[PDB]
Amino acid sequence: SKPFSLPILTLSELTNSRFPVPIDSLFTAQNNQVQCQNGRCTLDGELQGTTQLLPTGICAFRGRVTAQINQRDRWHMQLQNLNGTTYDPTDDVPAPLGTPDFKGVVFGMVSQRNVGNDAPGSTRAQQAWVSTYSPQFVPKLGSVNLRISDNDDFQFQPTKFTPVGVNDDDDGHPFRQWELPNYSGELTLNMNLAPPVAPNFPGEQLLFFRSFVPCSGGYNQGIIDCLIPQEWIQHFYQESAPSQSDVALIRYVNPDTGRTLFEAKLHRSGYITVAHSGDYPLVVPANGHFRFDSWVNQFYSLAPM
Amino acid sequence: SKPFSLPILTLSELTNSRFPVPIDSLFTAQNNQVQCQNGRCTLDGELQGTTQLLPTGICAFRGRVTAQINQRDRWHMQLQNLNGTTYDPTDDVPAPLGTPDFKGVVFGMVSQRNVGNDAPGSTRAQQAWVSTYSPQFVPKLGSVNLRISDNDDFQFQPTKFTPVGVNDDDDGHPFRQWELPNYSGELTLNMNLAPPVAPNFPGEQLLFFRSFVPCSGGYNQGIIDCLIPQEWIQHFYQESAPSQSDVALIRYVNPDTGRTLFEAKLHRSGYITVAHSGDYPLVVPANGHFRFDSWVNQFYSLAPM
Numbered sequence: 001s002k003p004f005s006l007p008i009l010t011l012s013e014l015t016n017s018r019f020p021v022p023i024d025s026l027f028t029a030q031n032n033q034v035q036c037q038n039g040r041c042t043l044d045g046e047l048q049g050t051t052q053l054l055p056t057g058i059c060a061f062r063g064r065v066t067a068q069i070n071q072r073d074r075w076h077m078q079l080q081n082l083n084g085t086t087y088d089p090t091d092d093v094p095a096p097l098g099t100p101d102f103k104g105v106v107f108g109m110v111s112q113r114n115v116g117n118d119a120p121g122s123t124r125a126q127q128a129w130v131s132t133y134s135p136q137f138v139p140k141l142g143s144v145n146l147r148i149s150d151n152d153d154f155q156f157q158p159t160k161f162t163p164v165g166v167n168d169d170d171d172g173h174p175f176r177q178w179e180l181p182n183y184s185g186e187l188t189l190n191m192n193l194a195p196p197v198a199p200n201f202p203g204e205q206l207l208f209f210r211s212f213v214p215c216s217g218g219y220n221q222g223i224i225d226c227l228i229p230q231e232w233i234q235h236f237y238q239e240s241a242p243s244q245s246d247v248a249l250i251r252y253v254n255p256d257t258g259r260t261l262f263e264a265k266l267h268r269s270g271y272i273t274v275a276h277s278g279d280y281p282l283v284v285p286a287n288g289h290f291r292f293d294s295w296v297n298q299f300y301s302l303a304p305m
Numbered sequence: 306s307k308p309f310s311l312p313i314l315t316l317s318e319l320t321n322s323r324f325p326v327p328i329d330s331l332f333t334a335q336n337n338q339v340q341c342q343n344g345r346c347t348l349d350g351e352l353q354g355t356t357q358l359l360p361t362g363i364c365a366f367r368g369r370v371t372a373q374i375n376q377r378d379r380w381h382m383q384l385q386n387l388n389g390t391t392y393d394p395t396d397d398v399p400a401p402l403g404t405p406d407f408k409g410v411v412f413g414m415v416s417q418r419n420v421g422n423d424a425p426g427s428t429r430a431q432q433a434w435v436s437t438y439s440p441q442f443v444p445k446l447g448s449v450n451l452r453i454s455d456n457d458d459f460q461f462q463p464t465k466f467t468p469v470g471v472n473d474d475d476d477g478h479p480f481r482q483w484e485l486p487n488y489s490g491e492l493t494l495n496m497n498l499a500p501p502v503a504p505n506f507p508g509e510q511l512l513f514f515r516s517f518v519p520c521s522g523g524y525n526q527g528i529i530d531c532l533i534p535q536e537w538i539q540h541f542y543q544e545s546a547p548s549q550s551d552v553a554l555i556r557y558v559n560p561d562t563g564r565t566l567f568e569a570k571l572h573r574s575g576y577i578t579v580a581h582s583g584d585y586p587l588v589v590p591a592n593g594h595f596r597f598d599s600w601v602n603q604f605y606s607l608a609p610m
């Protein structure tokens with residue numbers, strides 16, 4: 001069997017798998033549903049949820065604007081897959097890969113480049129917002145609607161949305177990173193979801209890779225927590241190493257000193273638990289990183305943090 | 306010796322190492338200086354130029370806004386390294402890692418999050434532009450100046466620049482992807498550069514990984530060509546396989562059929578040549594990818610493309 005491994009990367013050499021920014025810190029959370037759809041991959045390399053491989057694809061959209069309606073979510077964007085191929089709403093996924101997996105507003109920019117009969121090759125770009133609370137946020141069905149800055153400089157042409165940050169909506173719908181959008185809109189149930197994750201052994205908590213992402217006004221901290229970073233997902237996809245048991249024991253090491261600072265359980269479906277009680281932001285040395293130790297089972301007792 | 310290898314990734318699973326977008330196509334160019342500084346890495350895993358590991362770091366800036374001056378490039382941004390550590394202008398690099406490596410305008414957004422005594426935690430974000438033609442574009446010295454949309458909603462606070470696309474500057478300053486900026490400004494020479502690259506065998510041309518990136522007005526095609534994609538750089542940094550000669554023979558394979566479509570030379574300093582004459586956009590199958598074949602040398606004659 002090909003041996004399992006992690007890439008050797010410090011926290012600042014890691015990308016959040018749920019928003020296209022670096023990891024800032026590690027955080028373990030008090031128990032009490034975690035069911036994110038980006039940043040989902042098994043240790044033997046099976047992508048799940050809406051997870052795809054490119055960091056620049058996370059919370060991005062690609063397609064064409066085809067209509068406008070007289071509502072706040074004005075501009076109707078018919079989606080393609082991020083690689084430009086035609087999107088199939090009957091595929092066994094929750095939504096096009098890369099679609100945001102939280103309730104809130106994503107802010108960034110839209111850009112267009114004309115094709116066909118109308119001024120082919122002409123371009124434009126401007127600030128835009130996507131509300132995942134919108135009744136027109138129906139990416140599983142094949143479209144989302146955009147709010148933009150200048151309604152007079154926008155055409156029915158090929159369009160890309162590049163995310164920059166997140167926020168609460170100004171009408172009081174809050175940014176809730178653990179609440180899934182309704183991918184097919186009002187009165188529909190989400191399907192083909194990656195499953196919820198939780199500790200299943202006494203005294204254990206989830207460990208997250210945390211980023212503080214940009215916000216566009218107000219005091220929101222911009223916290224987005226992922227289960228495993230994007231480079232680990234990319235690595236597992238390449239390696240496809242067989243999982244020899246349900247849990248990989250991993251050690252956080254300081255390579256300068258060679259010491260192990262703490263240990264953790266990396267579960268086969270792609271998340272980490274540690275032995276601790278209470279919310280705790282880790283403050284650990286900058287050169288620190290995890291290494292694979294050995295395969296153990298679900299009932300292995302971790303050294304307390 | 307540890308065996309050299311490439312990651313197994315199709316073109317739409319690859320990221321441009323000179324701008325944070327996917328690869329669109331492969332392109333070989335007529336001969337006649339190529340000396341880009343992002344996307345530079347040796348086959349044995351040594352990053353060069355201004356190259357760092359994260360796609361989200363390419364053409365990004367991090368720092369603090371500290372002053373404003375009364376001209377178009379108005380807001381003075383004192384730079385940090387992208388991981389937030391203090392930038393040392395005496396280090397052996399051309400500029401902070403991630404700095405753009407072309408002449409033109411990069412457009413995107415700025416975001417702020419206050420620290421210290423003045424409304425800590427308050428945030429704001431808006432459209433911004435960085436001109437690499439500016440006499441205030443002096444990232445090696447530790448600063449760049451920004452143009453922004455709303456001069457009245459911007460503070461002397463921690464600031465991030467997120468790039469979205471590129472364009473020509475007006476008044477006759479064009480987007481020139483092969484012209485390096487003056488990293489220390491007018492009348493100073495760039496230093497610590499990754500070397501220029503060129504074919505050294507008759508009948509050979511460079512092969513590029515090409516993207517058509519967003520533009521913010523006008524008809525520019527947005528072409529940014531890189532020598533090797535970001536995932537290859539990330540892979541070589543991890544693997545650190547010894548280079549057994551100055552030249553690696555690689556083959557472009559269609560995994561569907563098992564056929565080799567063409568072969569190329571992958572040089573030790575991290576670029577590719579093919580045997581062809583003239584500008585040529587390749588049109589090859591979607592599942593195609595390069596594989597390493599064997600170590601060869603400068604006298605190997607490539608099969609014509």
Ligand SMILES: [Mg+2]
Binds near residue numbers: 005006007290292
């Ligand atoms: Mg390991």
Ligand SMILES: [Mg+2]
Binds near residue numbers: 311597
């Ligand atoms: Mg290979």
